[PDB]
Design an enzyme around this catalytic site. Structure first.
Site, mmCIF file in Angstrom:
data_model
loop_
_atom_site.group_PDB
_atom_site.id
_atom_site.type_symbol
_atom_site.label_atom_id
_atom_site.label_comp_id
_atom_site.label_asym_id
_atom_site.label_seq_id
_atom_site.Cartn_x
_atom_site.Cartn_y
_atom_site.Cartn_z
ATOM 1 C CG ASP B 25 -1.920 1.086 1.271
ATOM 2 O OD1 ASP B 25 -1.861 2.011 0.433
ATOM 3 O OD2 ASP B 25 -2.777 1.044 2.180
ATOM 4 C CB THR B 26 2.486 3.172 -2.720
ATOM 5 O OG1 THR B 26 1.341 3.374 -3.554
ATOM 6 C CG2 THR B 26 3.302 1.983 -3.227
ATOM 7 N N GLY B 27 0.076 4.165 -0.468
ATOM 8 C CA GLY B 27 -0.621 5.277 0.138
ATOM 9 C C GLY B 27 -0.640 5.277 1.648
HETATM 10 C C1 XW4 Z 1 -3.216 13.194 5.581
HETATM 11 C C2 XW4 Z 1 -4.239 14.110 6.252
HETATM 12 O O1 XW4 Z 1 -5.277 13.362 6.856
HETATM 13 P P1 XW4 Z 1 -4.912 12.043 7.821
HETATM 14 O O2 XW4 Z 1 -3.668 12.274 8.586
HETATM 15 C C3 XW4 Z 1 -4.714 10.567 6.719
HETATM 16 O O3 XW4 Z 1 -5.308 10.866 5.466
HETATM 17 C C4 XW4 Z 1 -5.208 9.782 4.557
HETATM 18 C C5 XW4 Z 1 -3.875 9.448 3.934
HETATM 19 C C6 XW4 Z 1 -3.769 8.265 2.956
HETATM 20 C C7 XW4 Z 1 -5.011 7.446 2.626
HETATM 21 C C8 XW4 Z 1 -4.925 6.216 1.624
HETATM 22 C C9 XW4 Z 1 -4.978 4.952 2.509
HETATM 23 N N1 XW4 Z 1 -3.915 5.093 3.479
HETATM 24 C C10 XW4 Z 1 -4.077 4.693 4.897
HETATM 25 O O4 XW4 Z 1 -5.126 4.347 5.332
HETATM 26 O O5 XW4 Z 1 -2.896 4.761 5.674
HETATM 27 C C11 XW4 Z 1 -3.037 4.874 7.099
HETATM 28 C C12 XW4 Z 1 -1.934 3.822 7.761
HETATM 29 O O6 XW4 Z 1 -0.766 4.438 7.493
HETATM 30 C C13 XW4 Z 1 -1.105 5.933 7.802
HETATM 31 O O7 XW4 Z 1 -0.498 6.669 7.007
HETATM 32 C C14 XW4 Z 1 -1.607 7.328 5.967
HETATM 33 C C15 XW4 Z 1 -2.788 7.162 6.497
HETATM 34 C C16 XW4 Z 1 -2.677 6.062 7.518
HETATM 35 C C17 XW4 Z 1 -4.725 3.662 1.723
HETATM 36 O O8 XW4 Z 1 -3.595 3.781 0.982
HETATM 37 C C18 XW4 Z 1 -5.903 3.402 0.725
HETATM 38 N N2 XW4 Z 1 -7.149 3.010 1.452
HETATM 39 C C19 XW4 Z 1 -7.553 1.578 1.375
HETATM 40 C C20 XW4 Z 1 -6.753 0.713 2.395
HETATM 41 C C21 XW4 Z 1 -7.271 1.075 3.822
HETATM 42 C C22 XW4 Z 1 -6.553 0.233 4.870
HETATM 43 C C23 XW4 Z 1 -6.947 -0.770 2.056
HETATM 44 C C24 XW4 Z 1 -8.406 -1.229 2.302
HETATM 45 S S1 XW4 Z 1 -8.445 4.158 1.422
HETATM 46 O O9 XW4 Z 1 -7.981 5.549 1.420
HETATM 47 O O10 XW4 Z 1 -9.252 4.065 2.648
HETATM 48 C C25 XW4 Z 1 -9.439 3.765 -0.078
HETATM 49 C C26 XW4 Z 1 -9.202 4.454 -1.425
HETATM 50 C C27 XW4 Z 1 -10.067 4.057 -2.627
HETATM 51 C C28 XW4 Z 1 -11.167 2.957 -2.459
HETATM 52 C C29 XW4 Z 1 -11.375 2.306 -1.166
HETATM 53 C C30 XW4 Z 1 -10.510 2.693 0.064
HETATM 54 O O11 XW4 Z 1 -12.437 1.344 -1.293
HETATM 55 C C31 XW4 Z 1 -12.731 1.295 -2.614
HETATM 56 O O12 XW4 Z 1 -12.013 2.450 -3.308
HETATM 57 C C32 XW4 Z 1 -6.344 7.777 3.259
HETATM 58 C C33 XW4 Z 1 -6.451 8.952 4.230
HETATM 59 O O13 XW4 Z 1 -6.155 11.742 8.889
HETATM 60 C C34 XW4 Z 1 -7.442 11.575 8.384
HETATM 61 C C35 XW4 Z 1 -8.391 11.163 9.547
#
Ligand code: XW4
Lengths: 99, 99
Positions: B25-27
């Protein structure tokens, strides 16, 4: 190009006539963009992640340019904290993971 | 390997002597695994995702092997919807995005 992962993989995208910064996100099935007033019809959807679900508007057949690579597909618009490019568009630009 | 993104980039990991499936998960900045028993001390932390914040248990300097590649780093354990390998470990196994 090649993008290392020391920092967030942020890139400039062009959608609906505007430039934005978005995350290349291999963990995202779908592409989710910050609130924006795109034209055309849409369908309600909910997408889940860490913390729960958010409500989004699904727009279909939207063109996005990602680092000069064109890609057309479904884009979700809603209260996401970050613009997210998901696999539906990453495949179209030939993006792979490599180690 | 070179991994395309037409399907979820799921791989087998080995942590605490136990095999599991996890998403590259590069995100994700951090690595977050579903609830499990892990040895050693831990500290309560919180991480935010698409749907808000959750409470997790932070394990530091945990040995984790990803698709045959060893990493030693921070592993968060809590109610994540899926096991995700985040950038803190993707960097260790030498993972890059390429297109
Ligand atoms: C930055 C300012 O706000 P913020 O600090 C964080 O904002 C963010 C930053 C990055 C993300 C992206 C997200 N990253 C993430 O969750 O990482 C967390 C753990 O590591 C930490 O580092 C970064 C966040 C923390 C995943 O990569 C992708 N995801 C799925 C994944 C979930 C486990 C697999 C199921 S998904 O986004 O939910 C999604 C997208 C399309 C879809 C879907 C679901 O379903 C169909 O299509 C989302 C919010 O606080 C906000 C409260």
């Amino acid at each position: 190009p090649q993008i290392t992962l020391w920092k967030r993989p942020l890139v400039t995208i062009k959608i609906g006539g505007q430039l934005k910064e978005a995350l290349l996100d291999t963990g995202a099935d779908d592409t989710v963009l910050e609130e924006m007033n795109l034209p055309g019809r849409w369908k309600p959807k909910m997408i889940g992640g860490i913390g729960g679900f958010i409500k989004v508007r699904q727009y279909d057949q939207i063109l996005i340019e990602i680092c000069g690579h064109k890609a057309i597909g479904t884009v979700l618009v809603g209260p996401t904290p970050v613009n997210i490019i998901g696999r539906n568009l990453l495949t179209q630009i030939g993006c792979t993971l490599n180690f």
